[PDB]
Amino acid sequence: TKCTLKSFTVEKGIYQTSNFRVQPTESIVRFPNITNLCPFGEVFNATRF
Amino acid sequence: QVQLLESGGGLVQPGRSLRLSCAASGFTFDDYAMHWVRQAPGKGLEWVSGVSWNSGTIGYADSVKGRFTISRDNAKNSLYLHMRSLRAEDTALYYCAKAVEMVRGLGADPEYGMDV
Numbered sequence: 001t002k003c004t005l006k007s008f009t010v011e012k013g014i015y016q017t018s019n020f021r022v023q024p025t026e027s028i029v030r031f032p033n034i035t036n037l038c039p040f041g042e043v044f045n046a047t048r049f
Numbered sequence: 050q051v052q053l054l055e056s057g058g059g060l061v062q063p064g065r066s067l068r069l070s071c072a073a074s075g076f077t078f079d080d081y082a083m084h085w086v087r088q089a090p091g092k093g094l095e096w097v098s099g100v101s102w103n104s105g106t107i108g109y110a111d112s113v114k115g116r117f118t119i120s121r122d123n124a125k126n127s128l129y130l131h132m133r134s135l136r137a138e139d140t141a142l143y144y145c146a147k148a149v150e151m152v153r154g155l156g157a158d159p160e161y162g163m164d165v
Contacts (some may be wrong), residue, residue, distance in 0.1 A: 039152060042080070047156030048105035 051165060053073040055145050067132035071145035077105075078126040082148055082159050085119070085130050087141030097143065100128060101158030113139055137153070 001015050070081035085097035098119045100106050106119045109146055114131035150159035
């Protein structure tokens with residue numbers, strides 16, 4: 001308040017001072033089921049070439 | 050329909066190299082195994098070789114292992130088997146067959162139950 005009113009003497013009353021603001025804790029990402037599965041058995045996990 | 054056209058042999062004097070070709074249809078080439086199985090006229094069938102979805106060839110028969118060389122042309126659905134020193138044991142009807150089993154027949158490629 002002293003640096004808001006720019007004074008070293010503050011009289012009885014009520015003075016808005018600042019802005020209370022909550023912060024975000026963590027991030028969240030979502031997307032439906034994969035359904036993009038690959039047959040690595042053909043591509044990578046192959047026994048006999 | 051299905052009609053597998055294999056050829057490449059004929060008036061072949063022994064001691065020369067060729068490339069027998071089988072063309073196949075009715076399926077997907079680079080995901081099904083085409084197998085060479087020989088059968089001489091008057092003689093029973095005998096397995097030669099194979100090629101799979103991963104081009105997974107395996108081997109050749111009793112006394113022919115090594116002289117043959119198996120290669121595939123996946124796009125135009127062609128199978129070329131190299132012919133070296135074709136004699137009375139090495140000459141036959143080089144049937145090309147397809148196994149019914151799908152991917153990962155288990156580890157081995159689909160090579161059993163080839164009724165077509």
